[PDB]
Scaffold this active site. Structure first.
Site, PDB file in Angstrom:
ATOM      1  N   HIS A   1      -0.758  -0.150  10.618  1.00 55.80           N
ATOM      2  CA  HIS A   1       0.209  -1.181   9.990  1.00 55.80           C
ATOM      3  C   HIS A   1       1.365  -1.105  11.090  1.00 55.80           C
ATOM      4  CE1 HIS A   1      -1.271  -0.560   5.895  1.00 55.80           C
ATOM      5  NE2 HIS A   1      -1.733  -1.441   6.066  1.00 55.80           N
TER       6      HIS A   1
ATOM      7  N   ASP B   1      -0.604  -5.794   8.930  1.00 53.07           N
ATOM      8  CA  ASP B   1      -1.709  -5.252   9.739  1.00 53.07           C
ATOM      9  C   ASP B   1      -1.935  -5.388  11.153  1.00 53.07           C
ATOM     10  OD1 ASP B   1      -3.010  -4.644   6.777  1.00 53.07           O
ATOM     11  OD2 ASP B   1      -4.000  -3.620   8.416  1.00 53.07           O
TER      12      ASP B   1
ATOM     13  N   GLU C   1       0.806  -1.098  -0.273  1.00 47.94           N
ATOM     14  CA  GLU C   1      -0.010   0.103  -0.095  1.00 47.94           C
ATOM     15  C   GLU C   1       0.821   1.352   0.109  1.00 47.94           C
ATOM     16  OE1 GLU C   1      -3.598  -2.351   2.229  1.00 47.94           O
ATOM     17  OE2 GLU C   1      -2.627  -0.730   3.094  1.00 47.94           O
TER      18      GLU C   1
HETATM   19 MN   LIG Z   1      -3.636  -2.587   4.978  1.00 49.25          MN
END
Ligand SMILES: [Mn+2]
Ligand SMILES: [Mn+2]
Ligand SMILES: [Mn+2]
Lengths: 587, 587, 587
Positions: free
Chosen positions: B524, B357, B333
């Protein structure tokens, strides 16, 4: 919904016939102000400016809180306080630190509103909430209700700049792509937008744009109209690619098809499109609430797809295949900071904005060396070649005409269909040079007319100082054909040209034309119709953005009055003042 | 070239047999400093550490200038000054503001190096150029040449962190894409990178990744060799897509081809590839000199193309189809801040870095209620579910094993091909869920072995404060199979899982497991093998990044000496010292 | 080792014809730049300036990083980036905040380097690492490789000032003694030298000088030589002491013995001396790596030992008993800050510097009153009397002749043994006034030929502001023999004089000669040959030292481009910029 202007009529609160004998002239002054703003200005998108007036006159805090109550159901983002009499300073002022605000005191003796002015401003400077002073030069009699000219200039210059501030607040800048070829302004500083402009930044990877084309996320029939409209109106120019990279007609058409789709899709991303909800695409229909945007383009799009020359040109123009409309603000090379100037320009003038490369300085000695004849007329001192790398609002042709038939650029609501089409008629669409734009494209070439008054601007971000504004008022010049043809062939003859002669002052960056070029803080610049440096100066002050370079005349500088207190020198006061107050929305 | 360590033997300048009697001991002390470092540490990439030693012992400015001259040609990024005697303070210290530096003073009586240490640390603090202190607990005899364990620990820790600082310097973060789903860390802050880490940031639109695949900018044979390896080695998991959205065996194949190609092209972009130069593709062959990267992915890419699950998991592993190698650092991401923490993680340890995560906190009560049984052992106080959105280094299975045969993660140079194969064998590749990842992809599901010590790190950016580092030491835990299966089905059963229990202290955010989860400053985190908190703390002080949360013991906290002067308190001293010295490289 | 200048040829990355067309012209641009610098400039010590050119043209981060590895190891303390084309801005710039940086854009139309220029500077200013703009006035043809005059001036001014910055880095100032009679400049600010100049300060007590003399820590054979040379050339003047204080020959010889031993010994303390190592004095052989020094003298040395008059004058001179050589920089009264102006002047010209008291302002009225005549020619607006208290570089006679007839001061590599001998011959060595210098001494008297152009400088430290620099360009003037003999004898007739007329400007401290005197911020000043105001300005901008006072032509102010961003006013922009960027090496 649009921002409204608030008008605060303040009064001496004591009775025994004192307040009573002022209530008539006081309210009437308020209603005269609101009428004048609505008569003589529009919002940049063309809608009428609504004013909101307090229900009663304001004498102290109880009335002020009730007026504020009213203002705050009505989305008012700028206020003007008016009076013809003494009133009780800090009891009656607008304490809201966000809204731009001004105060107009009637220059009278039976009606001493400008004495309230001086004290109200003192209150403002002392409480750290700067306000603008409107004070006419000439004593007016207690019954004269005509607004003089010097007052009108200030009421309109202030109202214009303040609506620009209010209209940016809440909105988005849409970054379609990231950095383009390591250009500073394409590294989009989110804090700059949020903190100084009250704006948000939406970033979207150019893949999204490819997805919308590939997966039919646009009105298929609008494309057919776009292509039809291009066939009618588009005059093509010579393909100057080497023969083995020249494209045939089936390839040429697909390039044009994609280019117009680029425009449609980008626009849809900026402001939404209802027709997409009707096709089962509800998420994509909303758009991103953006009043300006960037398209990275080079390198990662252009090495494989058609370039944005055509979409940039059209979206920044005052018209397309759907008719005349408000120009959008879409910045070449995702250069957000040229984007912000364009946005400032559009919110001030209602007109279209020309993105430009600040390409070349042609000195007199240089123009003579290569053409064998001298630069003359407005151009005599040197001249600057402004010419974007493919795209420019077609309005930049300046085939539109003012009431005396001179060439100019207008706000969309006064552009007729005959003038729109004459702009196209001044434009030849030229194939993009393949090696630079490997996916193709069509550049919008036109030659801007001569002797048209213009203002060049640029915002730059400086570490340790922050945002600054550059301004250079001048004129477009018209060069003899032989001369133009020669300097153009030498440069980029498939690209739109404007020859610009800046007004000099003898001092500093305006000593000579070379100095103007050398002190320009980036490779891009923005061209805004008219001499609108004073309008930019005012707005830069409401945003607490120092003006680092400008050639506007001393007596036209119009800032909140507490700037005077940071010094007589109009540059020193500005850096100190801007340092003091900081950005408007957060620090 | 790699950064070298510079070693500065510093001595009493006076003669009449005094300096002469100390030469051997002083220089042999310097060489033993070099030998210890080179025995016990390696660069993160696996290369030998090289230690340069001054030509002469240094007793003043002349000899100090010669040493600096020698070091400035050999790429030295960190220095250690050593001595067994009294030396002339400010005349002998390393004055370079930019490089990690330490001083080891022999704790002797006939050889009072630690007296020089005190005086030199004082000069360092008065002149604003902080240095680390190395001072053994026990007095040593004048002819003892062995290095005690407490001094070894500090020398080694100082060097680990030092070289990490020097290895980031000059290198790039590669942002492949822009922002993902409005995540803060993916609004990439060029200045944080430039000013705190001494890195540059290259931004690239995700359409270049597309272009590289479409226009065949890669090693066409390697793809085939990669597909082969993939077929041979990949176990596959249950396809949990609803039937109408499932892919057939032919489309499945393609999703795989493209996922591996992204792996290849992202790698190629990071470090360059010479096969592209053979192929005619000379511009693309250089790469961008990146030691860390990020891939945006959602939304704009994954709405039409295969996701980066497989690319990110493989690249972040210590091995692919070309065998065992140094693991890359690629944030999912485009989360650049998690990137930085992985970067820091990899440089401090040479191992692969797990991106996760921070997904669920499962309290004791919650687990009892949903499963009918309680948490116990290392898990009895609560559990944190760590689980990325499809990708995680395969090292993270912890199928690799130490000398004791315990599960662990290792530097790539201690990993047998049998162990590489074993981490793959513990991994099942699971199709992406179509609604979320519309172009498909294969996730990397493994369950992380229990009882392994880990360190969870995150960097964050706090406006008005700057970067901060969070740290949680703890252990992975093994749940009994019914508990795991149940909690897993409930969450995202196609994704890699690690059950994490952070060691509590009774105070602050470590009073209970809930508070650890609650205080974590992003969605995160990064998981690093072993209890490497002290290394991270040391590294942060070198970068002047305050640590806003940790659970490391007081006695392991190791920072520059001048941090003591900012307070006895190990947090107050940290915020004040970082506020004082500020970012290393600029402003 | 000497600092080198690094040259970075920069280029469009795209292949397919474009880069290949530019490789030749770009790389020659770079080769021609290096060539101009090596042919037209020298280090102050007289050595050839070596340049280092990147192994390839630079178009992105990978090559930029490669060029940096090559520079890191070659001691490049300054860079000049050159291009004839468009390139990818912030991917190609030099990111090192410590190095003086220039960028040269070729002003072509087919070759639009100046367009890269504008975009790179924007990147520099945005990232806080200001860079100088090198931009030619006139457009050149694509095929023209001549370097215009305006480009040459700036390349050399930049280079001249850049090498000065890098030549000071790492070097010591040797303070021989401490404060002299409460003079500010002699309370040496270590933090100033370290933070602004990157230098160190070594303090030594004058007793150490006493030690070298009495224990014979000097070259004994050289001493016989230094005496024989003094005997041959030293023309002694009148002894103005009251009779009871005059000295016999045997006593006058001992003073000269020691005055010369002080020169040898200070010199050896500055820079080492291998003979001391032959003589068994290994520690005193190294020196303290100094490029500047100060000698306290008064009160505590001079009340018992021969003063520094002779030593200072000969050490500051371009010659002595060993022939011509680089002149040292040795400040009287240990005025370290005059030492800084001197070091600056020597670094920017290669010449000898003249330490002076700013002793008397002689008004026009006042010379009429005292002499009966009026001041004429250059002296008509006022004169300033420049007379150090006993010593001055003999070069300051201006007996040296340039290529014409004209009197001047020259780089030592252009000084004949004839012109050395001549400089001595125009100088009378007059005994020191016992009541002030009880140890005796010989003052170095000479008179400076008129008409010679001079620049006067001072650095002052202002608490709350920092260092500031003062400049005054002007000329030496000649006065009638009867006019000068009145003023000389009224003042201090055994000390060297220069009469100085500062060029006026109508405004500020240059509104009249009085105001120049009144605004000078110390009792001491430095005289440097020629009109090198613009050099001081540029070097001041590199070191972030604001200029508080100068008579330099606006159009010759040459500072990094980001200064322009801090305003049009060339003084306000300098205080704002310096306040922003702050000292170079640490804050
Ligand atoms: Mn994520
Ligand atoms: Mn452009
Ligand atoms: Mn004095």
């Amino acid at each position: 919904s649009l921002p409204k202007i608030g008008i605060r009529p303040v009064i001496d609160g004591r009775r025994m016939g004192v307040r009573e004998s002022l209530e008539a002239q006081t309210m009437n002054m308020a209603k005269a102000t609101a009428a004048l703003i609505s008569e003589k200005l529009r919002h940049a998108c063309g809608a009428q400016i609504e004013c909101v007036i307090a229900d009663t006159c304001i004498a102290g805090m109880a009335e002020s809180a009730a007026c504020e109550e009213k203002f705050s159901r009505q989305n008012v983002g700028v206020t003007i306080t008016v009076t013809p009499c003494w009133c009780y300073g800090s009891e009656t002022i607008d304490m809201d630190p966000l809204r731009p605000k001004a105060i107009w005191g009637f220059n009278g003796t039976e009606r001493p509103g400008a004495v309230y002015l001086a004290a109200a401003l003192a209150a403002h400077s002392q409480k750290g909430i700067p306000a603008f002073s409107i004070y006419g030069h000439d004593v007016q009699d207690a019954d004269d209700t005509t607004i003089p000219a010097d007052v009108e200039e200030k009421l309109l210059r202030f109202a214009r700049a303040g609506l620009a501030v209010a209209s940016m607040k809440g909105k988005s800048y849409l970054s379609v792509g990231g950095v383009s070829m390591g250009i500073a302004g394409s590294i989009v500083d989110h804090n700059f937008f949020e903190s100084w402009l009250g704006m948000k930044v939406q970033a979207v990877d150019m893949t999204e744009l490819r997805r919308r084309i590939d997966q039919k996320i646009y009105d298929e029939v609008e494309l057919e109209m776009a292509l039809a409209w291009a066939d009618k109106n588009f005059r093509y120019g010579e393909d100057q690619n080497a023969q083995h990279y020249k494209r045939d007609e089936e390839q040429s058409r697909a390039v044009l098809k994609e280019s117009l789709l680029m425009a449609m899709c980008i626009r849809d991303m900026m402001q939404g499109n209802e027709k997409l909800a009707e096709k089962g695409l509800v998420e994509e229909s909303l758009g991103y609430n953006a009043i300006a945007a960037g398209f990275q383009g080079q390198r990662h799009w252009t090495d494989q797809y058609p370039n944005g020359d055509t979409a940039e040109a059209l979206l920044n123009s005052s018209f397309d295949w759907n008719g005349v409309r408000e120009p959008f603000v879409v910045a070449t090379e995702n250069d957000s900071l040229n984007g912000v100037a364009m946005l400032m320009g559009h919110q001030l003038t209602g007109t279209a904005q020309v993105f430009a490369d600040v390409r070349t300085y042609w000195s007199p000695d240089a123009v003579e060396r290569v053409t064998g004849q001298p630069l003359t007329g407005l151009a005599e001192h040197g001249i600057i070649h402004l010419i974007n790398s493919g795209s420019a609002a077609l309005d930049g042709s300046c085939q539109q005409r003012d009431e005396e038939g001179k060439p100019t650029m207008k706000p969309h609501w006064e552009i007729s269909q005959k003038e729109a089409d004459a702009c196209l008629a001044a434009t030849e669409w030229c194939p993009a040079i393949h090696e630079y734009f490997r996916g193709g494209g069509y550049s919008s070439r036109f030659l801007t007319e001569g002797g048209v008054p213009f203002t060049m601007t640029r915002v730059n971000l400086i570490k340790g100082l922050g945002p600054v504004l550059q301004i250079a008022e001048g004129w477009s010049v018209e060069l003899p054909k032989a001369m133009h043809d020669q300097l153009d062939a030498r440069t980029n003859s498939t690209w739109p040209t404007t020859w610009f002669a800046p007004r000099l002052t003898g001092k500093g960056p305006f000593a000579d034309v070379y100095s103007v070029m050398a002190n320009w803080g980036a490779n891009h610049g923005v061209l805004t119709i008219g001499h609108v440096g004073a309008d930019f100066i005012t707005l830069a002050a409401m945003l607490r953005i120092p003006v680092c370079m400008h050639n506007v005349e001393e007596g036209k500088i119009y800032r909140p009055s507490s700037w005077a207190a940071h010094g007589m020198d109009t540059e020193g006061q500005d850096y100190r003042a801007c340092q003091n107050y900081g950005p408007l929305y957060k620090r």
